[PDB]
C-alpha cells in the first residue's frame, strides 16, 4: 500500500534511495504494506488524472503523499477534487501542494500542512508587540481574503488588554493613478506599516511609496508571505530590510517530510485496526464512476486528527491547519538575500536579535546608559 509520487523536476536527489525503510523502522504496526514509489514529470490535468487513476488500480487500501515543485495554484484544488471523488486520503508537501486553500468540501479527505493566514497574523502581532510598537496602519489592496484578513486583525487587536493603537486603514482599490492613492499615502504618518498585496501589486505600491519618503531609516514593512516566492527572487526595487514570515525549508528537509508522512499513515492504520480491527479497500475503479453511493466504512477522518509520531506531535484540525507549524521569520539582507532570525517553535518566538540592526533602507538620540544597583538609588 501507500504510494508516493515524485519525478524530480529540480531536486534529482531521489531514485530508489527515496524508497528506503519507512514503516519498518521500530514501528509495531506491521501488515501487508509496502513503500511503493513513483516518478513523474510536469503536471497537466489529463496526465495527473490518468496517473492517479492508474495508481488506484493497486492502491486498494493505500494513500498518496504527492508533492510538487511549481507555483500553479490550481494543483491543490485538483488534488482536492481527486481526493473527494476517490475516498483516498492524501497530503501535500512542497510548492504547489503547499499553499493552503480556504474551504474544502466535507466529503473530502486531504490535509496539506501549510499555515493559515490567521496564524501568520497572530505571529506578526506577537513579534510587533514584543518590540513594543503598537501604533500601525493597514494599507492593503483588493485581493481575495483581504476582508477576512482585515476583520481577523481587528478582532484580534480588540480582544486583549495591551492597548494597540488602531488607525489609518487604507484599502485603495482604484488602480494607482488618481488622487485617492496620493492622499491615502500622504495621510499615514506612523513608523509601522503593514501591507498585504499580490506580488507585482506590492512591488508597484512600494515603488510609488518610496517617492513619498515613507521608506526612510525609521519605517517597517511586515508584508505577509505574498512577496516571498520559494527562493531569493526578491524584486530589484525591493529596497532592503523587509520583515517577513514564511514556511521553513532549511530546518526541515523533504527526506524527513516523507518519513513523517509515512509514519502518520502507519499510525493512522494502527489506530484504525485498534478501533475497528479491519481495514477494507476501495480499489473498485477510478473510471466508470457514479455507480455507488456513500459508504462510511473506514474513513480516516477520525483516525488522524490526534495522531503523533515518535513523541513528536503534528496533529491536524478541521482544515489543513497543523496546530504546530514550523513558521520562520526572515529579513531582507544587505546583499539582497533572506536572513533567519527566530523560529516559531513554541508559543514563544525565541528571537536572536536583542536590538534591531537598523537596516539601510535604500542603496538618532538613542544611547547606552550604564549603571548598577546600589542603595535606595538603583534597585534590581
Amino acid at each position: 500500500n501507500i504510494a508516493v509520487m515524485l519525478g524530480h523536476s529540480h531536486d534529482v536527489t531521489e531514485r530508489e534511495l527515496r524508497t528506503l525503510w519507512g514503516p519498518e523502522q521500530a514501528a509495531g504496526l506491521p501488515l501487508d504494506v509496502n513503500v511503493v514509489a513513483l516518478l513523474m514529470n510536469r503536471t497537466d490535468p489529463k496526465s495527473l488524472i490518468t496517473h492517479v487513476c492508474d495508481l488506484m488500480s493497486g492502491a486498494r487500501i493505500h494513500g498518496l503523499v504527492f508533492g510538487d515543485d511549481t507555483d500553479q495554484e490550481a494543483v491543490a484544488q485538483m488534488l482536492d477534487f481527486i481526493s473527494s471523488h476517490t475516498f483516498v486520503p492524501i497530503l501535500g508537501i512542497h510548492g504547489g501542494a503547499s499553499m493552503i486553500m480556504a474551504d474544502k468540501d466535507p466529503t473530502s479527505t486531504f490535509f496539506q500542512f501549510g499555515a493559515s493566514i490567521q496564524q501568520q497574523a497572530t505571529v506578526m502581532l506577537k513579534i510587533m508587540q514584543d518590540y513594543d510598537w503598537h501604533v500601525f496602519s493597514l494599507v492593503t489592496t483588493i485581493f481575495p481574503g483581504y476582508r477576512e484578513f482585515i476583520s481577523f486583525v481587528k478582532t484580534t487587536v480588540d480582544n486583549s488588554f495591551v492597548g494597540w493603537d488602531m488607525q489609518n486603514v487604507i484599502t485603495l482599490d482604484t488602480s494607482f493613478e488618481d488622487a485617492k492613492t496620493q492622499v491615502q499615502l500622504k495621510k499615514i504618518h506612523s513608523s509601522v506599516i503593514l501591507l498585504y498585496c499580490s506580488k507585482d501589486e506590492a512591488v508597484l505600491i512600494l515603488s510609488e511609496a518610496r517617492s513619498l519618503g515613507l521608506t526612510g531609516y525609521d519605517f517597517f514593512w511586515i508584508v505577509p508571505s505574498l512577496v516571498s516566492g520559494n527562493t531569493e527572487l526578491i524584486p530589484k526595487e525591493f529596497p532592503s530590510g523587509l520583515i517577513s514570515v514564511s514556511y521553513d525549508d532549511w530546518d526541515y528537509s523533504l527526506e524527513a517530510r516523507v518519513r513523517d508522512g509515512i509514519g502518520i499513515l502507519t499510525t493512522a492504520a494502527s489506530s484504525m485496526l485498534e478501533k475497528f480491527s479491519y481495514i477494507p479497500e476501495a480499489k473498485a475503479s477510478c473510471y466508470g464512476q457514479m455507480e455507488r453511493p456513500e459508504v462510511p466504512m473506514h474513513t480516516l477522518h477520525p483516525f488522524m486528527v490526534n495522531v503523533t509520531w515518535d513523541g513528536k506531535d503534528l496533529s491536524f484540525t478541521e482544515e489543513g491547519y497543523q496546530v504546530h507549524p514550523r513558521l520562520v521569520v526572515i529579513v531582507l539582507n544587505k546583499d539582497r538575500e533572506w536572513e533567519k532570525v527566530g523560529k516559531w517553535e513554541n508559543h514563544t518566538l525565541s528571537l536572536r536579535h536583542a536590538v534591531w540592526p537598523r537596516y539601510k533602507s535604500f542603496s538618532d538620540n538613542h544611547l547606552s546608559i550604564v549603571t548598577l544597583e546600589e542603595a535606595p538609588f538603583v534597585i534590581v
Partner: protein, 363 residues
C-alpha cells in the same frame, strides 16, 4: 478575412444545444461578420465526475475555446453542476459563465478564480430582507441559520448591512445541518422579545423546523415569519404556516433568456477586445501544455465591465465580485395555499401590490 474563435460549452439537453447554436448564429448576423465568425460547439452532461473532467479537457484541447457556458443539468439537488468544469478552466485563465447555479461557495474568488454568473446568489436575498425590514418598522430581527457555508455567508451579509444603520440583531442560534432534533433550539428561542423569526435553511431541514415549530405552538398570534427562496419549494411547501413571505426570483427558472443574454455579452466583449496589442491564441492539447496564457486576466477584466443593454432580462451588469447586480424578486405571500403575489422589489425600490397581506393567525 475572418478569424475563427470557438466559444461554446456544456449544456443540459440536445434541444438546448440546438437553441445555443441558433442563438450564436443570431449573434453573428448583427455587427461584424467579415473580421470574426465565432462558430460554436457543444457537449452534454455525464453522471461520472472524472469522465466529465476528461471530456471538458478534450473540449479545451480540440477547439482552443475563449469562454465556457456551464448551465445546470436536469437532475436537481446536487449543486455540482459547475464545479469540475470550473477547476479545469481554473487551471488556465479562460473565464466560464454560469447559467442557473445560485449558490454562495462560487462567489469566492480565492478558490474559483475564473467564474462569472448571470444570477444573484442568496446573500442578496439577505440584502432584500434588510431593506424590507428597515422600511417596515420591524427593527428587532431574530435569525436562524444552518451551520454550513451558505448560512454563514447569509448571516455575514445581513450583519454587515445592519452595521451601517447602527443596529443589532438578537440571536444567531445556529443548528447542525441535516440533523433530526431542533426542539431545544426553538424552546430556547421561545422566551425572548422578538417576533420576526428569519430562517435560511435547505429544504428538508426547513421542513423539519416547520414541523417542530408547528408542534411547539409557535405559529400564529404574532411572531411573524420570513423565509428564503428555497424554503417554500419542494416538500417544504407541504408543511407551512400561513403568513410566510417566501421571497423568490422572477424569471430565474428560465434558461432561454439567459442563453441569449450570455451569448450577447460574450460576443460584445470579444469584439471589444480584439482591438488590442498582440493577443495569443489559447492553449490546446491538455497533454503537451502546462502554462497559463497571458491574456486571461485581461479578458476577464474586459468582460467584467460590460453593459449589454437591449436584452431579455434588462441592463445586465456585473458587480466587481463576479455576481450579477440589480435583479428583480417577487415577494410571494401565502394565504390558504397557492402563493399569491404581493409586491415587487427592484433594488432599494420595494413596492407592494394592491392585494391584501395576512399574517400568521389572520389578524
Amino acid at each position: 478575412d475572418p478569424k475563427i474563435v470557438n466559444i461554446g460549452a456544456v449544456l443540459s439537453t440536445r434541444k438546448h444545444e440546438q437553441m445555443f447554436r441558433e442563438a450564436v448564429n443570431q449573434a453573428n448576423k448583427r455587427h461584424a461578420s467579415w473580421k470574426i465568425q465565432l462558430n460554436a460547439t457543444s457537449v452534454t452532461h455525464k453522471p461520472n465526475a472524472i469522465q466529465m473532467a476528461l471530456s471538458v479537457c478534450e473540449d479545451l484541447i480540440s477547439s482552443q475555446v475563449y469562454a465556457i457556458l456551464v448551465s445546470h443539468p436536469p437532475t436537481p439537488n446536487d449543486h455540482f453542476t459547475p464545479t469540475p468544469v470550473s477547476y479545469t478552466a481554473g487551471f488556465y485563465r479562460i473565464p466560464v459563465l454560469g447559467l442557473t447555479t445560485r449558490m454562495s461557495i462560487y462567489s469566492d474568488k480565492s478558490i474559483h478564480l475564473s467564474f462569472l454568473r448571470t444570477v444573484p446568489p442568496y446573500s442578496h436575498q439577505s440584502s432584500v430582507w434588510f431593506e424590507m425590514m428597515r422600511v417596515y418598522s420591524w427593527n428587532h430581527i431574530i435569525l436562524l441559520v444552518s451551520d454550513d457555508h451558505e448560512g454563514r455567508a447569509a448571516q455575514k451579509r445581513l450583519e454587515t448591512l445592519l452595521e451601517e444603520r447602527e443596529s443589532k440583531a438578537e440571536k444567531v442560534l445556529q443548528f447542525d445541518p441535516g440533523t433530526k432534533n431542533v426542539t431545544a433550539l426553538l424552546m430556547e428561542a421561545k422566551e425572548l422579545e422578538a417576533r420576526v423569526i428569519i430562517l435560511s435553511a435547505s429544504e428538508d431541514d426547513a421542513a423539519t423546523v416547520y414541523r417542530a415549530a408547528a408542534m411547539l405552538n409557535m405559529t400564529g398570534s404574532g411572531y411573524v415569519w420570513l423565509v428564503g427562496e428555497r424554503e417554500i419549494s419542494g416538500n417544504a411547501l407541504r408543511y407551512a404556516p400561513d403568513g410566510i413571505l417566501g421571497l423568490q426570483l422572477i424569471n430565474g427558472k428560465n434558461e432561454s433568456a439567459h442563453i441569449s443574454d450570455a451569448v450577447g455579452v460574450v460576443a460584445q466583449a470579444v469584439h471589444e477586445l480584439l482591438e488590442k496589442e498582440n493577443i495569443t491564441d489559447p492553449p490546446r492539447g491538455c497533454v503537451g501544455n502546462t502554462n497559463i496564457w497571458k491574456t486571461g486576466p485581461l479578458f476577464k477584466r474586459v468582460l467584467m465591465s460590460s453593459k449589454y443593454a437591449d436584452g431579455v432580462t434588462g441592463r445586465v451588469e456585473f458587480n466587481e465580485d463576479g455576481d450579477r447586480k440589480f435583479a428583480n424578486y417577487s415577494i410571494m405571500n401565502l394565504q390558504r395555499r397557492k402563493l399569491v403575489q404581493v409586491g415587487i422589489y427592484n433594488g432599494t425600490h420595494v413596492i407592494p401590490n394592491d392585494r391584501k397581506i395576512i399574517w400568521p393567525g389572520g389578524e
